[PDB]
Amino acid sequence: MYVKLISSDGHEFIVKREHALTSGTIKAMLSNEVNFREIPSHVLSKVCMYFTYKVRYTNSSTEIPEFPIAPEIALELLMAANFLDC
Amino acid sequence: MDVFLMIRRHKTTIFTDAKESSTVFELKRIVEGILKRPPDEQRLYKDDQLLDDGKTLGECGFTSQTARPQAPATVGLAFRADDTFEALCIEPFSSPPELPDVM
Amino acid sequence: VLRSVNSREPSQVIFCNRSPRVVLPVWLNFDGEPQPYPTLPPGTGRRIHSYRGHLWLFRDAGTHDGLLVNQTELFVPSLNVDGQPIFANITLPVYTLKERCLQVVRSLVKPENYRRLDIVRSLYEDLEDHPNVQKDLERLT
Numbered sequence: 001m002y003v004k005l006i007s008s009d010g011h012e013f014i015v016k017r018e019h020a021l022t023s024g025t026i027k028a029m030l031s032n033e034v035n036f037r038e039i040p041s042h043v044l045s046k047v048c049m050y051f052t053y054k055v056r057y058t059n060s061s062t063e064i065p066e067f068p069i070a071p072e073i074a075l076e077l078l079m080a081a082n083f084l085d086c
Numbered sequence: 087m088d089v090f091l092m093i094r095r096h097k098t099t100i101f102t103d104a105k106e107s108s109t110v111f112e113l114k115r116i117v118e119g120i121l122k123r124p125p126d127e128q129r130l131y132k133d134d135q136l137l138d139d140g141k142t143l144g145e146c147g148f149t150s151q152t153a154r155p156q157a158p159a160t161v162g163l164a165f166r167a168d169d170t171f172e173a174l175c176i177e178p179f180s181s182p183p184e185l186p187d188v189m
Numbered sequence: 190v191l192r193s194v195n196s197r198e199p200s201q202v203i204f205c206n207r208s209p210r211v212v213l214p215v216w217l218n219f220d221g222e223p224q225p226y227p228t229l230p231p232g233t234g235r236r237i238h239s240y241r242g243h244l245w246l247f248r249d250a251g252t253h254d255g256l257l258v259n260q261t262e263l264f265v266p267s268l269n270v271d272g273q274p275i276f277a278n279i280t281l282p283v284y285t286l287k288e289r290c291l292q293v294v295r296s297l298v299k300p301e302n303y304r305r306l307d308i309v310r311s312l313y314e315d316l317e318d319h320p321n322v323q324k325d326l327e328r329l330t
């Protein structure tokens with residue numbers, strides 16, 4: 001079961017609904033596509049990668065690796081993560 | 087062992103996972119469920135290489151330690167419009183700006 | 190409220206840093222004051238003498254970012270069974286994306302320059318609100 005997150009520049013990211021419901025903001029925007037007019041694709045792809053990461057490593061005994069973030073995208077990602085509350 | 091993927095065509099990106107032991111064809115079924123196109127109208131690629139239906143994602147080089155949740159591997163996707171397959175095309179993501187003077 | 194119990198009952202512990210951070214172990218002394226101890230580099234461990242009922246938490250030595258120990262905030266050395274130390278397993282938490290972003294931004298920008306970043310005021314405040322041990326001791330209390 002999937003939802004579509006669309007970046008400001010038209011890229012369409014298709015992720016599992018439960019991965020997206022991580023974000024309270026997206027939960028609200030759904031209650032099933034969501035258009036993000038401020039989030040470019042090089043940020044939204046990272047947001048989707050985090051969903052996968054959180055779902056995989058939340059409550060896990062297997063050692064947890066650092067979630068990587070390039071300096072180039074950190075500001076923009078911070079803005080997005082703040083807005084999405086994730 | 088799970089592998090984590092971005093299946094990409096044009097401006098479409100699918101985030102999903104699969105078993106290392108699962109087949110290219112089985113990945114196409116997943117795409118079929120999501121994009122409503124049968125396997126015969128699909129080609130999957132690793133970089134420039136055309137993938138064979140019967141081969142496992144493991145043989146094709148998608149392993150659990152390279153295809154990671156936080157940094158998943160890309161699988162190219164191309165559709166057959168009617169008679170012939172289109173060429174593999176993946177629109178790049180937008181570019182981040184210059185690092186501010188303070189960073 | 191959060192202090193070590195002066196039990197005087199030895200308990201040996203293995204501090205095991207299974208994180209990519211340089212780890213600062215903090216012993217909460219008998220008046221609740223955090224006492225820093227020597228650091229552990231990533232992937233290293235140390236056999237240490239502590240005591241039953243003593244309270245320890247663990248941070249990133251550089252940024253004071255919070256870490257987990259055996260899946261929780263606080264580690265309390267328990268009774269040693271059959272001459273075996275207690276394993277204290279220090280790992281990264283699953284930080285929220287927001288806090289992770291803030292760590293990386295803090296690591297690139299000197300505190301003097303947060304105000305020059307082109308972001309809403311409230312993120313400027315979130316950056317300046319560094320992870321702090323006293324804060325979390327009040328939070329845990």
Ligand SMILES: CC(C)(C)CC(=O)N1C[C@H](O)C[C@H]1C(=O)NCc1ccc(-c2cncs2)cc1
Pocket residue numbers: 204214216226227228229235237238239240243
């Ligand atoms: C009141 C005192 C500090 C003397 C009671 C005491 O002996 N403590 C408090 C804690 O339970 C730990 C213990 C202690 O200080 N043991 C010596 C010790 C020395 C180095 C280290 C470390 C070495 N590297 C990282 S931590 C840990 C314990």
